[PDB]
Amino acid sequence: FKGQPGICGLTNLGNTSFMNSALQCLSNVPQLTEYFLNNCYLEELNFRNPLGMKGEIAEAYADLVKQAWSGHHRSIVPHVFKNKVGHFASQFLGYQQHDSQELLSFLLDGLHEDLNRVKKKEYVELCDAAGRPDQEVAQEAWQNHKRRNDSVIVDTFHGLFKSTLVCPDCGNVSVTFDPFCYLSVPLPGAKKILIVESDTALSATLRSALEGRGFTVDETTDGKGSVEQIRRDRPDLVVLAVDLSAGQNGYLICGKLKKDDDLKNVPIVIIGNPDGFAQHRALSAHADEYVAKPVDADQLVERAGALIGFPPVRLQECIELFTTVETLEKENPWYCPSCKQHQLATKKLDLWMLPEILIIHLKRFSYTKFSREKLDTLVEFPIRDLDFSEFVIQPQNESNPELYKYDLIAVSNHYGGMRDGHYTTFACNKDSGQWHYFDDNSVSPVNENQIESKAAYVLFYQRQDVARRL
Amino acid sequence: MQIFVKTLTGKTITLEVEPSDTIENVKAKIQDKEGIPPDQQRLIFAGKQLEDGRTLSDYNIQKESTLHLVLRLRGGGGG
Ligand SMILES: [Cl-]
């Protein structure tokens, strides 16, 4: 039939929805697809690169791109691509379910080496940043990366992080720059609140009030087990009652949490008779907030939002958390070479340079002693006008507006658990601006307000200057 | 030298390594601090996922660089 170019499904070859999803994201990266449709890749095939596969990844991907954008096919069977992918990365041999960002990482790397313009990779020790301006240090680090990696992949997807360490003792500052291809951002939380309260009627009232603003709420009247339940369920906030059954004391439980080095950072809202607040602030480690009993439910909800922020989790807050100033904990001190000793230094990641196409990877997973599970909380992300000027505009940096703003072009969606699931893709067609939902063979048009869902796992963003350059 | 790993929650940990350390060794040290089995760990630096058998210098991981640690969301859809 005569289909629309790029509007083409991909048959599942046996647990390969993760591959199809990654492929649909990439097919709708405009400069990559044009690079392959114009045969620009033929002149940059690197057959002697030991880290490549004799161009086979680039040629098989090119064939997929050409077939999908021909308008000749409703759907395509990418079996050759799968066989070449597995030959390059043996884990993908067979019929296993896989992570779609992992497949993308290997695919992008395969394309990069197969088209690497460097003949041989040289290791060059970076020089001390001490006393040199940030831009000069950043340039040396990018040029060290480019001396080894110079391809359309680097030109399209790679940016630069600044990482800064500050010694709390002597003030020594240590600057480093790392290239990146995936901006893997942590989640601030799941907007889950645990209520530790032996008054079950009161607890249910507060649960409804909180759920009325979108919080997930768990409840427990068992004070003895509360510390360990907090360690297991990892709530974003604890509403902790002072007077508990079986002679438990919320103030004492708070003390236990503030003494534990894992649990000391969990926000704690104490609800109790007000006449107990002065003493706890005078004698003990402060709860993060005190709310007087009979509880004004609106006041408690207001305080919860002020501490952890109202639902839902915003992509902006993931990026802000990623770039936050963090203090190294006692297990991870930095050896300051100026004062020649281990220090609980502060570390901050900054977005120094951002690529034409930005891949944002949400860390939708958690690992504790007790369980590993997927974080499935809704993360709101913008379809248009994602503005990084508040993160990139830092001392020794500037730009023009379109350089720091992005529009979404694709989303890889995951459904299921960590080890059993399914992948689909939202993607915006470069020729028409219409979004579609790709589920293996099934391709359907969608509006922009349908893209966002808790299934979103990998976001592809296109810098607003990119559309214009042609 | 020292390098850093930004973990699942964003918390950065510190590793004592040599440039010739293998990725298996690095993963073992990560497990020492965070308890994640090495087979579940995916480590990313500069748009490379780090593979057992190669060294930190192979991936151009120099001092005070930060690795990025992720897990897997596996999916196949059957099909
Ligand atoms: Cl490299």
Author numbering:
A (entry chain A): 302 to 612, 778 to 936
B (entry chain C): 1 to 79
Text taken from the publication that reported this structure:
USP11 regulates multiple important cellular functions, including DNA double-strand break repair, cell cycle progression, and signaling pathways such as transforming growth factor beta signaling. The paralogs share the same modular structure consisting of an N-terminal domain present in USPs and a ubiquitin-like domain, followed by the USP protease domain composed of subdomains D1 and D2 interspersed by an insertion. Linear ubiquitin chains are particularly poor substrates for USP11 (15, 22, 23).
To trap a Michaelis complex intermediate for crystallization studies, we mutated the USP11 active site cysteine and confirmed that the mutant was inactive. Crystals belonged to space group P 21 21 2 and diffracted to 2.44 Å resolution. USP11-D1D2 adopts the canonical USP protease fold with thumb, palm, and finger regions. The catalytic triad residues C318S, His888, and Asp905 are within hydrogen-bonding distance and adopt an active conformation. The Ub-GGG NH group of Gly77 that is equivalent to a lysine side chain’s NH group in an isopeptide bond forms a hydrogen-bonding interaction with USP11 Gly887 from the BL2 region. The USP11 SL loop Gln398 side chain closes over the substrate’s C-terminal tail by forming hydrogen-bonding interactions with the Asp886 side chain and Gly887 from the BL2 region.
